[PDB]
Amino acid sequence: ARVTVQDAVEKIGNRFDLVLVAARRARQMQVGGKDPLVPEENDKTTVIALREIEEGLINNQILDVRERQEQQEQEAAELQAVTAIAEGRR
């Protein structure tokens, strides 16, 4: 099947939870660049192509979870505020 996928649903007593754990955060990593990701480059997927590795994926960040934190409206309020992101050419 896939790598470390059935291990994330057995470690915690829920499946629908793991979804947003690697959803509202994963899609947020791209719209925020890549700097917000402070963990080491160890927890990262591997893509075999041209004798090198690219992309990034996820499902390898879920380790230190918690109950109550932030609401749900600020997730994309101060995120797109600190970093605007765009696309320019020479």
Partner: peptide, 17 residues
């Protein structure tokens, strides 16, 4: 469910709310 998450900017947003 929308109560708990997994963001906090990995340690750059816990002091934002």
């Amino acid at each position: 469910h929308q109560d708990r998450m997994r963001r906090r900017a990995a340690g750059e947003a816990p002091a934002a709310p």
